[PDB]
């Protein structure tokens, strides 16, 4: 599955960071079966923390590390699964992953963004 994300995303401290993610799946998005997981790992060999998940609706896990700054910013039926991180902080630097399953499409999609926080 083709997943389009910026490999590196550079955002100023305090600004809003939209993490763009779209995916080219031919099959129509069935909200009763579509699956999306967004996770966060500090490094390629570090632990992933799921922070948002779609399962027939939007699920925001409200991880303490993000406070209430995470928002969904996509539209699954339009093949957009982007998220928004409001008022970015230096600790938000790291790796963010968009996982995508669009049954009955066989292949799972994976986008990986390296978010860097500028002064």
């Amino acid at each position: 599955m083709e997943v389009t994300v910026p490999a590196t995303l550079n955002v100023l401290n305090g600004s809003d960071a939209r993490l763009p993610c779209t995916f080219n799946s031919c099959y129509t998005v069935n909200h009763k079966q579509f699956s999306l997981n967004w996770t966060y790992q500090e490094c390629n060999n570090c632990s992933e923390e799921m922070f948002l998940q779609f399962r027939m609706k939007i699920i925001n896990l409200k991880l303490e590390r993000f406070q209430d700054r995470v928002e969904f910013s996509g539209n699954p039926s339009k093949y957009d699964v982007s998220v928004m991180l409001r008022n970015v902080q230096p600790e938000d630097e790291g790796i963010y992953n968009c996982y995508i399953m669009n049954p009955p499409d066989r292949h799972r999609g994976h986008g990986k963004i390296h978010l860097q926080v500028l002064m």
Binding site: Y27, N30, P104
Partner: protein, 1420 residues
């Protein structure tokens, strides 16, 4: 000018520009023998060694002023140029541009470009190229850039008239190179389609391959004749599509909905929350295995929903929703299906199931007009178009030849040990006739010995075949090596057939010695081609060899582009839709595995392009439209249809006419040997006569008036027309009595007894009729007449059935079976209707030819079937699970023994074989018939390409490249045999024509007397211009209604009426329905307005023009339809009647034809064809009827597997004729055959108690099923070929004759006054020498200008005694010059002679002694 060769110099240029200045100061065609691209004329001879490939002064004097110059190739090729400095930089004298031309004109360069193109094609074929292909495409872009730079640097870019860009193909090269540059240096995006654009590289082939430009030009010019016949096909598809839209609008949406919706659900709350085809099934009725609901219908003759299921109209059209009639668009699509007959069986069995069986009439009309008529019009015009070219070219060709001869002639006028002993021995030992007969009988025996293969071959038989092929290889090898040493090895390899034999014996020794286990088709099929050495003697198989040799010969370049096309489309399909499939497979095949026909690989892409070529495009089109959208897929598939089918049709007609040119390719003298076989024939005849004489010698050494009265009586009573009519009445009634014998006959328990007693009465009447004919004609005259024999046979069968019934010996096996032979009773009618009689005796006169061209076909298919049996022989034995029917996965149950173990441990698993497999040459013939008719070929192919071994579970596509076998088979068989066949048929249907004196074959006497007047109607043109009537206002009214303005406005009004009739669609808003009704109201009132205007003006004369009669008919029908449909809508209810009445409005749409001369002439050819088509339709209806009776008789209680539904089931003379009409177009006969072929009771159940009836046993008889279906297919094919010939003859006829009529009376009166000035005595006799001034004294059109004697001798005027001539013969001879050779000539000749003999009985003074030409021949 043999010495016209001067290097292009600056001095010459100076003279050129000087002459240009002289021309410009004072203000012919280019000679078609000095153009570029052709070959250099011979008058120049060979080129000096230095001058070749160098700027040469332009040789055509046409360009002698322009700044142009030629350079000639070392192969004497011509190349124009422009002497203007290229790009205002490179003079023709700059050594750079010099060597540029040098490198451009060559043969290394064309081969370079062609090789690069071929490599680039090979690289295109890959779908996922590895990394180094980047550098390879770099190299190709490099070569293209360099060659384009060479060309543009040599011939100038555009800075001159003769230049790069003016070359049209060079535009394609420019596009290719610039797109390569962009695609490499911009990374534009969405490259999935950009990458495709580089396929145009493969088109540069056409520019490079010497002599393809002319072929593509030929095809392009062959299209331009499809102007009218495409207007007409769009128009007919549109009219029939509006009809289909009006009848079936939204019909293919009925779905057997449930009836016990709980949870307070309704149809809508459900139809919203319902997505998965596993959930639709819970609420609708899906057949055991299928992916649609069960189309039902509200009427009684449509399908039927099972109990507890109501038929409602909701959901999604059938077949992925693409095919239906909901919108005009889908109507046009479904009708393109039904016209190209491409899997139309499913549209048939879907509408007939939804709308009702009664609507089969619609299909009858569509398939007979739209499928049959259009394909024939196409096949006509291209043919005619193609034929034209041949004549022209061949004419032009021979013309040039003559010039060459004259060209030549002008030049001629200007000139004015014991090893040799053994060799001789053996060369005598190869006795031409006897050893030739030996080789031939051994060839035929080897073939008939290979055909003895079957699937379960006992090892004894197998080793027998082994040693047999051993001995045959030995014999053939021995004789070939003998012939080799008999003559010089060189002389042996000289003759082609010996190369053939040597190649084949080589292959045989190869696989005998090496025992190649990996390949079987390597040898076991190639030893077969020896059967072609029968071409030596067989003068028909030799025609198949000549057709093929043409296909790879003279008419071979054309075939090339076909390959190119079938390649290009192929790779196009692989680049657009390639990734699309694998990405979207889950939609088109629920298993998430690519469908059998994807385009994800080049091979499969070529498969699908071949499939759409052979006329099966629709299923692949649904899949492709599901995945890659309806936008690209329709463009691609319609482009493939049109282009590919056009090229295949031009190829086919090319081979056809080039083989029929047997009259034009007959230039051979007496054969060096008539037939080496015939030598042995004569010699054995000599020997047999010798031994006959000797044995006869040795045998002789060892040893009442009343009776003739009665016969005249009976002759009268049997010729008397009342008797013939009565007999035909009885025949028709007997056929009806047969037709009522359904399966429901036991329910109608009164019709049964009436029909029984009526069968008794009918057999009695026919016995009495037989006796009457006997007493009348006499056994001698009677048994001579064949028709009388068919009557005798059939009435004797009836008599023996009757006596067996009355004796009580019924139910004694055969006798009961004999009752089914009763079904031949309708055939007794074949002799009473002269239409059927004349068609049947035509086809019987044409049988002999198809005997030869079916024997060659049978040998050919036998070759293919043994090739088959060798490859596929019990490798079809899959281990299916019967519950769903899914071949088990080859991972488990690999070898059959495991399939049987699984049977033992489980259920519903059957080591199942196909039913039309290749197990022995018998079933081989059947499956080849299927593959050659594309009906079932798909199942045979799939189960074959999965073959693994003699008994092993077939893997999914373990032997893929055996598809090739089918395609190669298809081609030859279905595209050469047929071709060959068609050849003789036209020749045959030409010879028979010439046999009768140009008469038309398929018409009676009366039909011909009609036909002649129907031809009279065509091109009448005596039409009087109606006079302008006497009234002020009527004045302006007529002035209006006569101008082209008013008529063209009416036409555009009709076109708008069409476009407002097609803009309706299923489910449209109420508002749109009302406004369309009001627009139609306005169109109705406006057309009535123009009719009333024509009436007001033309007065009575309106009803003169036939087209005006049609206008009045349509306007009345239309206002009726309006009012009556209104009354239906308000008073009555039934919608079906309402729509079938409202359908009448399309008359106005039909009214368009008036304007187009082109559309009219076509369908006028149709209406003059309709007689012959009526006779053929009658005969085809007899055959369809006779087969329908057999259907109802023995195929009624067969199982219901596939193509035999609850409907379409041989259970009634209604359903039986449905199915027979289905398979009349050869469609779907595979399916109808499939359930009959069950015999043994794991497939059937021969003790199935049919409820109500009493005929146990529910599986038909295979040996009669295959006979039934193959015979009906072949008869349908012959009758359809007759139809094709009829329509093509009519089309060839209408075009050739164009005619007008001149007539004048005052010309006679001026002829009389000029007669008095030369004949004062009114003796009606004038001197021939004085006629030289007489004929030059008349006024036009009778005036003939001096010299008159040049033409007067050619008129053939008789002369009475005394060098004198009558008045009438001169007046008529002059009359024939102006009026021509019309039918009125000989009629006017009679009336003027009869009026003269009544006034001048003195015949003694009329007797002519000679004519004008014979006397001059006596003078000279």
């Amino acid at each position: 000018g043999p010495q016209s060769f001067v290097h292009f110099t600056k001095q010459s240029l100076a003279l050129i520009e000087q002459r240009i200045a002289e021309r410009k100061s004072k203000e012919p065609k280019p000679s078609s023998d000095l153009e570029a691209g052709k070959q250099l004329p011979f008058i120049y001879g060979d080129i000096p060694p230095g001058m070749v490939s160098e700027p040469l002064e332009d040789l055509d004097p046409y360009y002698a002023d322009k700044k142009t110059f030629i350079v000639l190739n070392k192969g004497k090729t011509i190349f124009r140029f422009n002497a203007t400095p290229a790009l205002y930089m490179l003079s023709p004298f700059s050594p750079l541009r010099r060597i540029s031309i040098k490198i451009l004109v060559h043969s290394l360069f064309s081969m370079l470009i062609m090789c690069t193109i071929l490599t680039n094609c090979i690289f295109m074929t890959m779908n996922n190229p590895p990394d180094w292909t980047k550098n390879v495409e770099y190299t190709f872009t490099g070569i293209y850039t360099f060659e384009s730079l060479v060309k543009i640097l040599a011939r100038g870019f555009c800075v001159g008239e003769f230049t790069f860009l003016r070359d049209p193909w060079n535009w394609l090269d420019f596009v290719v190179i610039v797109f390569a540059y962009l695609t490499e240096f911009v990374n534009l995006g969405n490259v999935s389609a950009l990458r495709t654009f580089r396929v145009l590289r493969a088109l540069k082939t056409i520019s490079v391959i010497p002599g393809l430009k002319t072929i593509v030009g030929a095809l392009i010019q062959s299209v331009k004749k499809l102007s009218d016949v495409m207007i007409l096909t769009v128009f007919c598809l549109s009219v029939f599509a509006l009809i289909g839209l009006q009848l079936f609008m939204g019909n293919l949406k009925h779905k057997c909905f449930r009836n016990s919706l709980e949870n307070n659900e309704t149809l809508e709350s459900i139809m919203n929350t319902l997505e998965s085809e596993e959930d639709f099934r819970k609420y609708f009725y899906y057949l055991e295995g299928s992916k649609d609901a069960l189309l039902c219908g509200f009427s009684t003759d449509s399908g039927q929903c099972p109990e507890g299921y109501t038929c409602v109209k909701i959901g999604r059209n059938p077949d992925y929703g693409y095919t239906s009639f909901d919108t005009f668009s889908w109507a046009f699509l479904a009708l393109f299906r039904l016209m190209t007959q491409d899997y139309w069986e499913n549209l048939y069995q879907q509408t007939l199931r939804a709308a009702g069986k009664t609507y089969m009439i619609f299909f009858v009309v569509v398939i007979f007009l739209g499928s049959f008529y259009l394909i024939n019009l196409i096949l006509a015009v291209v043919a005619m178009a193609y034929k034209e070219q041949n004549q022209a070219n061949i004419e032009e060709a021979k013309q040039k030849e003559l010039e060459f001869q004259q060209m030549l002639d002008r030049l001629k006028k200007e000139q004015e040990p014991y090893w040799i002993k053994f060799k001789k021995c053996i060369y005598f030992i190869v006795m031409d006739p006897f050893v030739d007969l030996a080789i031939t009988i051994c060839i035929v025996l080897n073939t008939l010995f290979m055909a003895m293969e079957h699937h379960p071959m006992t090892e004894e038989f197998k080793n027998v075949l082994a040693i047999g092929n051993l001995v045959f290889t030995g014999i053939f090898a021995a004789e070939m090596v003998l012939k080799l040493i008999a003559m010089d090895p060189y002389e042996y390899f000289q003759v082609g057939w010996n190369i053939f034999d040597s190649l084949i014996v080589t292959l045989s020794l190869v696989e005998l010695f090496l025992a190649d286990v990996e390949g079987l088709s390597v040898l076991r099929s190639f030893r077969l081609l020896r059967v072609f050495k029968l071409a030596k003697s067989w003068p028909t198989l030799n025609m198949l060899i000549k057709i093929i040799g043409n296909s790879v010969g003279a008419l071979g370049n054309l075939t090339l582009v076909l390959a190119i096309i079938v390649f290009i489309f192929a790779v196009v399909g692989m680049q657009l839709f390639g990734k699309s499939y694998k990405e979207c497979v889950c939609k088109i095949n629920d298993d998430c595995t690519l469908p059998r026909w994807h385009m994800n690989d080049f091979f499969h892409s070529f498969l699908i392009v071949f499939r759409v070529l052979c006329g099966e495009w629709i299923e692949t089109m649904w899949d492709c439209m599901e995945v890659a959208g309806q936008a690209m897929c329709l463009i691609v598939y319609m482009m493939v249809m049109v282009i590919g089918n056009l090229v295949v049709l031009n190829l086919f007609l090319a081979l056809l006419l080039s083989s029929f040119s047997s009259d034009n390719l007959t230039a051979i003298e007496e054969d060096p040997d008539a037939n080496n076989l015939q030598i042995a024939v004569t010699r054995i005849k000599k020997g047999i006569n010798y031994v006959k004489q000797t044995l006869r010698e040795f045998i002789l050494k060892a040893f009442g008036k009343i009776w003739w009265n009665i016969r005249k009586t009976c002759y009268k009573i049997v010729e008397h027309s009342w008797f013939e009519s009565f007999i035909v009445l009885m025949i028709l009634l007997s056929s009806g009595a047969l037709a009522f014998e359904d399966i429901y006959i036991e329910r109608k328990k009164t019709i049964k007894i009436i029909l029984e007693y009526a069968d008794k009465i009918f057999t009695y009447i026919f016995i009495l009729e037989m006796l009457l004919k006997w007493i009348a004609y006499g056994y001698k005259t009677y048994f001579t007449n064949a028709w009388c024999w068919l009557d005798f046979l059939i009435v004797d069968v009836s008599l023996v059935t009757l006596v067996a019934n009355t004796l009580g010996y019924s139910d004694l096996g055969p006798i009961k079976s004999l009752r089914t032979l009763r079904a031949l009773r309708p055939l007794r009618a074949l002799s009473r209707f002269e239409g059927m009689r004349v068609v049947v005796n035509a086809l019987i006169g044409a049988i002999p030819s198809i005997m030869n061209v079916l024997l060659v076909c049978l040998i050919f298919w036998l070759i293919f079937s043994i090739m088959g049996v060798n490859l596929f022989a019990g490798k079809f034995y899959e281990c299916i699970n019967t519950t769903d029917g899914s071949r088990f996965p080859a991972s488990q149950v690999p070898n059959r023994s495991e399939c049987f173990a699984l049977m033992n441990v489980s259920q519903n698993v059957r080591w199942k074989n196909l039913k039309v497999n290749f197990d022995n040459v018998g079933l081989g013939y059947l499956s080849l018939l299927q593959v050659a008719t594309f009906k079932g070929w798909t199942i045979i192919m799939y189960a074959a390409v999965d073959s693994v071994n003699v008994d092993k579970q077939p893997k999914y596509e373990y032997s893929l490249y055996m598809y090739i076998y089918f395609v190669v088979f298809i081609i030859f068989g279905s595209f050469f045999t047929l071709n060959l066949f068609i050849g003789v048929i036209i020749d045959n249907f030409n010879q028979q024509k010439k046999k009768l004196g140009g008469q038309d074959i398929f018409m009676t006497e009366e039909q011909k007397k009609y036909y002649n007047a129907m031809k009279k109607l065509g091109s009448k043109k005596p039409q009087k211009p109606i006079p302008r009537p006497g009234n002020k206002i009527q004045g302006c009214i007529f002035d209006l209604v006569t101008n082209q303005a008013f008529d063209i406005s009416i036409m555009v009004l009709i076109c708008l009426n069409m476009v407002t009739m097609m803009v309706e669609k299923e489910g449209q808003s109420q508002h749109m329905t009302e406004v369309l009704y009001w627009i139609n109201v306005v169109f109705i009132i406006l057309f009535t307005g123009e009719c009333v205007l024509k009436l007001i003006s033309l007065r009575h004369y309106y009803f003169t023009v036939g087209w005006n009669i049609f206008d009045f008919v349509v306007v009345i029908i239309s206002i009726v339809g309006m009012f009556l449909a209104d009354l239906i809508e308000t008073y009555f209810v039934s919608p079906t009647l309402f729509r079938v009445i409202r359908l009448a409005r399309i008359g106005r749409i039909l009214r368009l034809v008036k304007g187009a001369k082109g559309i009219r002439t076509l369908l006028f050819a149709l209406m003059m064809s309709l007689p012959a088509l009526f006779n053929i339709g009658l005969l085809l209806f007899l055959v369809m009827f006779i087969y329908a009776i057999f259907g109802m008789s023995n195929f009624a209680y067969v199982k219901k597997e596939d193509g035999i539904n609850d409907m379409f089931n041989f259970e009634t003379f209604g359903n039986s004729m449905i199915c027979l009409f289905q398979i009349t177009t050869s469609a779907g006969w595979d399916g109808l055959l499939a359930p009959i072929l069950n015999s043994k009771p794991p497939d059937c159940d021969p003790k199935k108690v049919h409820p109500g009836s009493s005929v146990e046993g529910d599986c038909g008889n295979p040996s009669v099923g295959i006979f039934y279906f193959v015979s009906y297919i072949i008869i349908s094919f012959l009758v359809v070929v007759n139809m094709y010939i009829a329509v093509i003859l009519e089309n060839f006829s209408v075009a050739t004759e164009e005619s007008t009529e001149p007539l004048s009376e005052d010309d006679f009166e001026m002829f009389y006054e000029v007669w008095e000035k030369f004949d004062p005595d009114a003796t009606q006799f004038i001197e021939f020498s004085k006629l030289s001034d007489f004929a030059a004294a008349l006024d036009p059109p009778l005036l003939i200008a001096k010299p008159n004697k040049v033409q007067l001798i050619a008129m053939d005027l008789p002369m009475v005694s005394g060098d004198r001539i009558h008045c009438l013969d001169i007046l008529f001879a002059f009359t024939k010059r102006v009026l021509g050779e019309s039918g009125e000539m000989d009629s006017l000749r009679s009336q003027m002679e009869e009026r003269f003999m009544s006034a001048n009985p003195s015949k003694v003074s009329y007797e002519p002694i000679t004519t004008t030409l014979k006397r001059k021949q006596e003078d000279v």
